[PDB]
Design a binder for this molecule. Structure first.
Ligand code: CLA
Ligand code: CLA
Ligand code: CLA
Ligand code: CLA
Ligand code: CLA
Ligand code: CLA
Ligand code: CLA
Ligand code: LHG
Ligand code: BCR
Ligand code: BCR
Ligand code: PQN
Ligand code: SF4
Ligand code: SF4
Lengths: 74, 80, 739, 148, 61, 160, 130
């Protein structure tokens, strides 16, 4: 179980790292855009601030309250 | 050696040239700004990559850009 | 129009209180980003950049010293007030060996009243490990009324120091020439402060502490002991305990000082009743110290044709190997506050560590050697303070080199010649650090791998390849033979740690010969190695603070800057501040190892109980000799074994120690976020957070910016130190209070 | 206890995803570096200018998210191993009671079950678990060298 | 646009992109970026002004 | 009942916990003397422990096999005082805080020196705004309707 | 005492050049001073100028330029920096056209100038495999 979960975490981090690499060196905005309008992938860079802000909110929410309940029990 | 590029947003304020520690940048005549001068990078073989040049740049997103590249004993700052 | 002070230099007004950052030229314009807030506190006490005049900096420093002394006096007044009102000091006086000192009671809220422990003497509260009860007993304080009056005096003194600071900044500020009278200052601090303080304390001991403590040790209850003033008005209450006061001061003025041998003794060892140093020995010590310091205060020429000039002394100490010698050092130390701070802080931390050693080595207070929590806490606290102060001295030496160092004024002197061969110093210190670390730690690892491989005869142990600290054992033998041979007027060795008998008070060991074997060899060399690496980091910071082969103009970047850029392969942390940051880390490592060695060695081979027939049983049972030679031994028989009390403290009166254990772990792990990450990621995340705020029209006008690189490092190191020191604090306190 | 640890796992997953998604989306540029795509996936920084640009590349986002992945997998594996140790030993009441607070974890999982491991070799002898104690110390040493 | 006019920044690589600034002076010479705009929010370098081209600023009504 | 739990009023382990805590407190009480403040404090501890256990028993609280109150937060109003009512209370208080903060930010954002009024608070205006947050649910659903709650395109965006 | 009479009165430091500035390249800075001012070496400590011709050798161009920047504080401007290859291959470096790089001089052509801002840079995906 430990081996497979560690391999799983490694693979997930690698998937996201290679997505970032694709953004850096393989992504072409012209291909993902037709007459100003952007396709499903290019639109992920338009509300990127919304995505990051809501990920930050969820992380802060869960961390604050999980740590709060754990420390309350402590 | 590193690569240094100058962009026409240059206002010719000379702060990049007087901040270079290895005499890479110099001011040359130009007609694209009020000062009539633009920065140049004719001695990039001495560029060390310290990026003091673009710390002194007042333009919005810089007019001098340093792209780190292949390393050399001059660019690595090796006294040995 | 006095020649030493300026009258009414600064007006007492609240106008500048409402203008934050008024001191700084850059911060006075007002905040535009959140970096301004952090810069406000980082430059508050940097008086060098607030004024261009040494006089103004000196006056600010003088008033800040007064404020600090007022704070210290308030803290002492609070301690005495807690002893007077929220303590069991009276109960502890009648039963020092069976009542645990407590001077802080906890309010009954949210179930926290469990922290009020069963300290004894019909009292509930938090056990105190600062040793105030023993100190007060040594002072002759036998009532809580005296503690209350000392607290009132402390409050009055704190107000007086506050008024003095205000007066000497706003009403009569001294001039630069007054501050630069280092000869007069040294004369006064040596004679008046040190010598007259020792003399006054010797007088207090002789007239108050000597009789009261002698009566206490004789079994007289504190209620029937006469009030301290009666020992002065009546020469018969003190002449019964010490039958030499009947002659008055005539033996003193007739040079017949042998008559005062009743209360000015030279005995050594410890009082068999209390386990502390003989207070007659302490009074004689303070008297001798007073005379020596008063004599030493008449050395430097101040206002007459008499004494020394420090300039002439330094300038005459040249040599073939040192060029101009100490020429210019007087100008350095009379024109730079940072150099004085460096020297004073380094020697002050070293003095604190020496104090910590001599404390447990020769317990100076009654019933403090058998209070193991007090001894452990005092040693660890003083060693921590010493390490911090030493790192601060190194930091301010680097600051002096960056800011106040003048190359022209230091031509071919000692400072110049040190910088001229900094490479040799740093390279040889690097080699020494590698040698010491390789040896000490690799001997530890060799022991660990030999034990793991089932080869017990290949270890660096006593029953194996043995590394006997013969030099230290020779010194131990020399001290235990000193009384009667080299100290012929001594009756006992200075400390029983060097050898002698086991001293026990109430079946608890006070002091005992500390045997040194191969386990002490390895840990002592570990101490030497860690100290050498810390010195390496700090000395590299000081010497390379102005220039290097990487950055030939590092002095133009200041003392505190993050880098010079990603070029030259990367120029992170080249400052001198970034060396006080790494040196802080390594000081934490060294001091942690030192206090671990002390705790384990004392618990395993000094502290414990003595059976009526004379059999000594220790807290752990002598496992230090054979199990402190491997890292697995330290992990298991010390950390895992003695952490049992901390983890099992929940539901008991020590549960606060477990909570602080967990919280310090949390803070230490929190530090690694700042230590491992970088500013760009956090700035770009704040970008999206700011986007959300702007979308909801709630973006602050003060633009939020991620902490600067230097501030990120400072936050990381501060959290790391707090977490580690707090974890060790909770671990030590819970372990040594439980057992 | 399962509820609280599952929420901890969710927090770890969300934070690792936040770091990785932020690095992926901000890979092509941001306000601090609107030309980050011109510097590639992995570069040290953009210099001390503009307030400081440490760890600004997309590679640095992976580097930071590796710590959070390790922490999340550690939480998951700690939960699984403690639950199954209590199930196999039979004292499932030990987990159900002590798993709701952090000191319960620290005392009853780590401190409790680390006793057989550290006694893989002692000043008295050794067991077949001696290699595991050596690997324990080796892992601690490599961890702290990483800290270096 | 003229002195005192309010414009929106259309330069993408700008700390004030999509934001509104105040025009300080529009140069009448043959310079490449004549429009000088002052902003209330300082950028990451601390500056609060920048020169923009004629096609990189859009006047607010 | 819900999730296999049982009411704490009929949980034997709950009463065992109460008895053990009271016994420990009384044993601690035995080592002090007469009506001395330590005995008074321990007696107050015993009384508070008994009151807390009695209140938890008579509180519609479900206890597990460990004799500790478990919270039923699936949303049912039967156990609504455990999560739902505190949830509403916190939502009200936190919305109050956020609303007054946002109103103060937007109010001093239209003055000559917006940044000065953030380190040096305009206490009169701050007090005026803070006591006006009791209508934050109504104010929020009166500013969202007018379009004054959300910005549209003056918000800044990165290069991609 | 010293090899050349124009050397600054420096006592020598273990921070000077190494074997690199004997087989790869060394840098020499020359200047004339009116006074025997005491200045700080870029490598070690304090040296004394000569009231006349002064010549100093360093291992890096940055060291010579740091020394020259220090010289400007002494109102010294005529300092000139040269690069010397393993043999006597002298090349004037810093006052390349006799005018400091901060002052515009006719006869200089722009090197590394792009006729667009940062936003005009090509997309990296279009710069693959060249
Ligand atoms: C099948 C999966 C797969 C594939 C095909 C690739 C392929 C690639 N990756 Mg990638 N990656 C993967 C999984 C994968 N990765 C995962 C799972 C992660 C997350 C950890 C990453 C994270 C990652 C990053 C962050 C980067 C790449 C990069 C690259 C490219 C260059 C690789 C390189 O230079 O290697 C270099 C190989 C090494 C440096 C060797 C490292 C060996 C490590 C340290 C382990 C060795 C220690 C070993 C355990 C010793 C034991 C100690 C003992 C005491 C017990 C290449 C296209 C790089 C790139 O530029 O892409 C364009 C880049 O920056 N990848
Ligand atoms: C015990 C150590 C510790 C703790 C508590 C945190 C806590 C946090 N990290 Mg973190 N981090 C750590 C170690 C730690 N980190 C290490 C070692 C690294 C490797 C460098 C990182 C790398 C990292 C990255 C790259 C990111 C975080 C993020 C976060 C936040 C996630 C949201 C959250 O839980 O909010 C709740 C917060 C807490 C529970 C902790 C603070 C609450 C205290 C107790 C309040 C006390 C008030 C008095 C949070 C502040 C992410 C973030 O910023 O999300 C918004 C993010 O992007 N961290
Ligand atoms: C500077 C050192 C110092 C420290 C750390 C403390 C710390 C403490 N004092 Mg204290 N005290 C001090 C100096 C100090 N005092 C001095 C100099 C005096 C003499 C005036 C007192 C007189 C004093 C009294 C009379 C009492 C305390 C109490 C307390 C405790 C509760 C404080 C509290 O909740 O106040 C909260 C304060 C505020 C909210 C104001 C803001 C706390 C442990 C109380 C205590 O222990 O209760 C049992 C208590 O009754 N102190
Ligand atoms: C015998 C005379 C004497 C004595 C006792 C002291 C004592 C002290 N001086 Mg001091 N000083 C003296 C002469 C003296 N000085 C002279 C002649 C000069 C001129 C060169 C200075 C210049 C000087 C400076 C520039 C500084 C000191 C500081 C200090 C303090 C060091 C902190 C310490 O150890 O805490 C021990 C603390 C105590 C024992 C508390 C009780 C001490 C009280 C306040 C008695 C102080 C004696 C005072 C000089 C009497 C003047 C009263 C006034 C009405 C005239 C200490 C209180 C430093 C300090 O902390 O500043 C405040 C500091 O920065 N002194
Ligand atoms: C006599 C002691 C002494 C004195 C007078 C000074 C004085 C000074 N130091 Mg200094 N220093 C000291 C000891 C001292 N230091 C020690 C022991 C160290 C080693 C850690 C240092 C390390 C150091 C560095 C690295 C730097 C200074 C700097 C400075 C200057 C500016 C200080 C400032 O504005 O801070 C204002 C005060 C603060 C910002 C307070 C910060 C809060 C601290 C870090 C946390 C304390 C936590 C506390 C223990 C409570 C935690 C409990 C928790 C549960 C809450 C000033 C001349 C700086 C400078 O530029 O010098 C010119 C600088 O860069 N010092
Ligand atoms: C456990 C983690 C760890 C370890 C092992 C070290 C080790 C060391 N640090 Mg440190 N350091 C650490 C954490 C650690 N650090 C952290 C967390 C920080 C952050 C603040 C620092 C910051 C720091 C600074 C700032 C400095 C050091 C320095 C040193 C070196 C001192 C010289 C020495 O003893 O070398 C000897 C090496 C050892 C003792 C390591 C073990 C070697 C074994 C026991 C013997 C040889 C084994 C053999 C060769 C194996 C061969 C087989 C193999 C090929 C398979 C040493 C390499 C100093 C330095 O550069 O050196 C002078 C220095 O200036 N460190
Ligand atoms: C008081 C005004 C206020 C308001 C209305 C908001 C509103 C918001 N913040 Mg926020 N924030 C504030 C202050 C405020 N914040 C402050 C002062 C900080 C610095 C610690 C942050 C740090 C912050 C982060 C890091 C994040 C948010 C996020 C968010 C959004 C989701 C809610 C959330 O996660 O709460 C977050 C709340 C906190 C972390 C605690 C705030 C600290 C106190 C309680 C607020 C200050 C009170 C203030 C002093 C009152 C003074 C007013 C008075 C003078 C009249 C939402 C737009 C998240 C987001 O973007 O999601 C979309 C997110 O990731 N905020
Ligand atoms: C220890 C050696 C020692 O201190 O001898 C002392 C030796 C004698 O130097 P000087 O005679 O020149 O010192 C005279 C005056 O400077 C007094 O300090 O000093 C050195 O040569 C420093 C070399 C350290 C070399 C480290 C080994
Ligand atoms: C409940 C249930 C169910 C359902 C289930 C489901 C529906 C699931 C789903 C799941 C899912 C749905 C999952 C997902 C996941 C995802 C992920 C994991 C992702 C990741 C991502 C990534 C990693 C990305 C990457 C990238 C980037 C970053 C950009 C560029 C491109 C790419 C793509 C490369 C059923 C009915 C069957 C039955 C049982 C019950
Ligand atoms: C505890 C404490 C306190 C208190 C303190 C005190 C109380 C002190 C005292 C002190 C004192 C009370 C001191 C005294 C001193 C004195 C002296 C120091 C004297 C001297 C004298 C002399 C020196 C003389 C000499 C001579 C002459 C000149 C002539 C004749 C001959 C002869 C020789 C005799 C307080 C509250 C603050 C705070 C807290 C802590
Ligand atoms: C998180 C983080 C930030 C962001 C951190 C910020 C913006 C600090 C925010 C502090 C808040 C706003 C105030 C403090 C709030 C605390 C609750 C108060 C402290 C607790 C008291 C008990 C002392 C950096 O700027 C940074 C820079 C360089 C390296 C690493 C990091 C880094 O890790
Ligand atoms: S890096 Fe920037 S500063 Fe250093 S040389 Fe090249 S251009 Fe001049
Ligand atoms: S930012 Fe971090 S890495 Fe980039 S230069 Fe400054 S310090 Fe070196």
């Amino acid at each position: 179980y430990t081996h497979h979960q560690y391999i799983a975490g490694f693979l997930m981090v690698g998937a996201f790292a290679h997505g970032a690499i694709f953004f850096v060196r393989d992504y072409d905005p012209a291909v993902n855009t037709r007459n100003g309008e952007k396709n499903v992938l290019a639109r992920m860079l338009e509300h990127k601030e919304a995505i990051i802000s809501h990920l930050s909110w969820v992380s802060l929410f869960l961390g604050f309250h999980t740590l709060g309940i754990y420390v309350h029990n402590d | 050696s590193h690569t240094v590029k100058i962009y026409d947003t240059c206002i010719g304020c000379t702060q990049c040239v007087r901040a270079c520690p290895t005499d890479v940048l110099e001011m040359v005549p130009w007609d694209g700004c009020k000062a009539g001068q633009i920065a140049s990078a004719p001695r990039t073989e001495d560029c060390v990559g310290c990026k003091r040049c673009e710390t002194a740049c007042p333009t919005d997103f810089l007019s001098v850009r340093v792209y780190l590249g292949g390393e050399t004993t001059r660019s690595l700052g090796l006294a040995y | 129009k006095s020649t030493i002070v300026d009258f009414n230099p600064v007006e007492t007004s609240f106008e500048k209180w409402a203008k934050p950052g008024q001191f700084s030229r850059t911060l006075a314009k007002g905040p535009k980003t959140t970096t301004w807030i952090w810069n406000l506190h980082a430059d508050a006490h940097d008086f060098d950049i607030q004024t261009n005049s040494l006089q103004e900096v000196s006056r600010k420093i003088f008033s800040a010293h007064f404020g600090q002394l007022a704070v210290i006096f308030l803290w002492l007044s609070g301690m005495h007030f807690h002893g007077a009102y929220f303590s069991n000091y009276s109960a502890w006086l009648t039963n020092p060996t069976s009542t645990k000192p407590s001077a802080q009671i906890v309010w009954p809220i949210v179930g926290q009243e469990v922290l009020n422990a069963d300290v004894g003497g019909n009292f509930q509260g938090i056990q105190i490990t600062s040793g105030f009860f023993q100190l007060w007993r040594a002072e002759g304080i036998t009532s809580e009324v005296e503690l209350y009056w000392t607290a009132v005096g402390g409050l009055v003194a704190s107000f007086l120091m506050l008024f003095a600071g205000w007066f000497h900044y706003h009403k009569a500020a001294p001039k630069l020439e007054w501050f630069q009278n280092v000869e007069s200052m040294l004369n006064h601090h040596l004679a008046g402060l040190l010598g007259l303080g020792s003399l006054s304390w010797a007088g207090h001991q002789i007239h108050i502490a000597l009789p009261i403590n002698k009566l206490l040790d004789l079994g007289v209850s504190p209620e029937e002991i006469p009030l301290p003033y009666e020992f002065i008005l009546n020469r018969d209450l003190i002449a019964q305990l010490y039958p030499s006061f009947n002659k008055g001061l005539t033996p003193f003025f007739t040079l017949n000082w042998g008559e005062y041998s009743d209360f000015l003794t030279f005995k050594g060892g410890l009082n068999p009743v209390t386990g502390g140093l003989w207070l007659t020995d302490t009074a004689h010590h303070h008297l001798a110290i007073a005379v020596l310091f008063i004599v030493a205060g008449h050395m430097y020429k101040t206002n007459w044709f008499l004494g020394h000039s420090i300039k002439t002394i330094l300038e005459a100490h040249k040599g073939p190997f040192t060029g101009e010698g100490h020429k210019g050092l007087y100008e350095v130390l009379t024109t730079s506050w940072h150099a004085q701070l460096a020297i004073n802080l380094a020697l002050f931390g070293s003095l604190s560590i020496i104090v910590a050693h001599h404390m447990y080595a020769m317990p100076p207070y009654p019933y403090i050697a058998i209070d193991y929590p007090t001894q452990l806490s005092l040693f660890t606290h003083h060693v921590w303070i010493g390490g911090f102060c030493i790192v601060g001295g190194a930091a301010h030496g680097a600051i002096f080199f960056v800011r106040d160092y003048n190359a022209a004024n230091n031509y071919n002197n000692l400072i110049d010649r040190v910088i001229r061969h900094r490479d040799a110093i740093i390279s040889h210190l690097n080699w020494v650090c590698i040698f010491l670390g390789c040896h000490s730690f690799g001997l530890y690892v060799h022991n660990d791998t030999m034990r793991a491989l089932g080869r017990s005869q290949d270890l660096f142990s006593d029953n194996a390849i043995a590394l006997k600290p013969i030099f230290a054992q020779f010194i131990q033998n020399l001290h235990t033979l000193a009384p009667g041979s080299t100290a012929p007027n001594a009756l006992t060795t200075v400390s029983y740690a060097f050898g002698g008998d086991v001293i026990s008070v109430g079946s608890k060991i006070a002091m005992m010969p500390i045997s040194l074997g191969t386990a002490d060899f390895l840990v002592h060399h570990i101490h030497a190695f860690t100290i050498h690496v810390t010195v390496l980091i700090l000395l590299k910071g000081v010497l390379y603070s102005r220039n290097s082969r990487l950055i030939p103009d590092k002095a133009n970047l200041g003392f505190r800057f993050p880098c010079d850029g990603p070029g030259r392969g990367g120029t992170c942390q080249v400052s001198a501040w970034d060396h006080v940051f790494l040196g802080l880390f390594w000081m934490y490592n060294s001091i942690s190892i030192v206090i671990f060695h002390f705790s384990w060695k004392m618990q395993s081979d000094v502290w414990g109980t003595v059976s009526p027939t004379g059999a000594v049983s220790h807290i752990t049972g002598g496992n230090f000799a054979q199990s402190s030679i491997t890292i697995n031994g330290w992990l298991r028989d010390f950390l895992w074994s003695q952490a049992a009390q901390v983890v099992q403290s929940y539901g008991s009166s020590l549960s606060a120690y477990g909570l602080i254990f967990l919280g310090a772990h949390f803070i230490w792990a929190f530090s690694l976020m700042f230590l491992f990450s970088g500013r760009g990621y956090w700035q770009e995340l704040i970008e999206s957070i700011v986007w959300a705020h702007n979308k909801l029209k709630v973006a602050p006008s003060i633009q939020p910016r991620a902490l600067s690189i230097t501030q990120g490092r400072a936050v990381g190191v501060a959290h790391y130190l707090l977490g580690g020191i707090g974890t060790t604090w909770a671990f030590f306190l819970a372990r040594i209070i439980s057992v | 206890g399962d509820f609280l640890v599952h929420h901890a796992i969710a927090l770890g997953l969300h934070t690792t995803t936040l770091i990785l998604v932020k690095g992926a989306l901000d890979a092509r540029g941001s306000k601090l570096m609107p030309d980050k795509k011109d510097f590639g996936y992995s570069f040290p920084c953009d210099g001390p200018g503009r307030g400081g640009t440490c760890d600004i590349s997309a590679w640095d986002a992976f580097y930071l998210a590796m710590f959070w992945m390790l922490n999340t997998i550690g939480w998951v594996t700690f939960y699984w191993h403690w639950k199954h140790l209590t199930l196999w030993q039979g004292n499932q009441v030990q987990f159900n009671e002590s798993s709701n607070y952090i000191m319960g974890w620290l005392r009853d999982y780590l401190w409790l079950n680390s006793s057989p491991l550290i006694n893989g070799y002692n000043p008295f002898g050794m067991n077949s678990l001696s290699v595991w104690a050596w690997m324990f110390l080796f892992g601690h040493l490599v961890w702290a060298t990483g800290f270096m | 646009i003229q002195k005192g006019s309010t414009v929106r920044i259309l330069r993408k690589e700008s700390y004030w992109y999509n934001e509104s600034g105040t025009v300080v002076v529009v140069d009448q010479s043959k310079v490449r970026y004549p429009v000088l705009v002052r902003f209330t929010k300082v950028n990451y370098a601390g500056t609060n002004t920048n020169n923009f081209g004629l096609n990189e600023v859009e006047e607010v009504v | 009942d819900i999730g296999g739990l049982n009411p704490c009023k009929d949980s034997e382990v709950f009463q065992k916990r109460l008895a053990k805590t009271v016994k420990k407190l009384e044993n601690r009480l035995k080592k002090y003397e007469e009506g001395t403040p330590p005995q008074i404090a321990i007696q107050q501890q015993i009384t508070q422990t008994k009151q807390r256990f009695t209140r938890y028993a008579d509180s519609n609280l479900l206890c597990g096999n460990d004799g500790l109150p478990h919270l039923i937060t699936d949303g049912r109003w039967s156990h609504g005082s455990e999560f739902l009512l505190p949830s509403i209370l916190f939502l009200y208080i936190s919305g109050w805080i956020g609303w007054v903060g946002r109103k103060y930010i937007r109010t001093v954002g239209q003055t000559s020196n917006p940044t000065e009024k953030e380190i040096i608070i305009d206490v009169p205006l701050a007090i005026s705004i803070m006591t006006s947050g009791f209508l934050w649910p109504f104010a929020a659903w009166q500013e969202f309707l007018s379009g004054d709650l959300i910005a549209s395109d003056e918000t800044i965006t990165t290069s991609p | 005492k010293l090899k050349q009479s124009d050397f600054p009165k420096f006592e020598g430091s273990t921070g000077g050049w190494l074997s690199a500035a004997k087989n790869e390249e060394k840098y020499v800075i020359i200047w004339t001073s009116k006074d025997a001012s005491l200045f700080e070496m870029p490598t070690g400590g304090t040296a004394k100028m000569n009231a006349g011709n002064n010549v100093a050798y360093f291992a890096r161009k940055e060291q010579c330029l740091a020394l020259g920047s220090q010289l400007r504080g002494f109102k010294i401007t005529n300092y000139k920096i040269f690069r010397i290859y393993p043999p006597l291959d002298i090349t004037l470096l810093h006052p390349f056209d006799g005018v400091f790089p901060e002052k515009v001089n006719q006869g200089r052509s722009p090197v590394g100038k792009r006729d667009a801002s940062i936003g005009g840079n090509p997309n990296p995906a279009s710069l693959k495999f060249q």
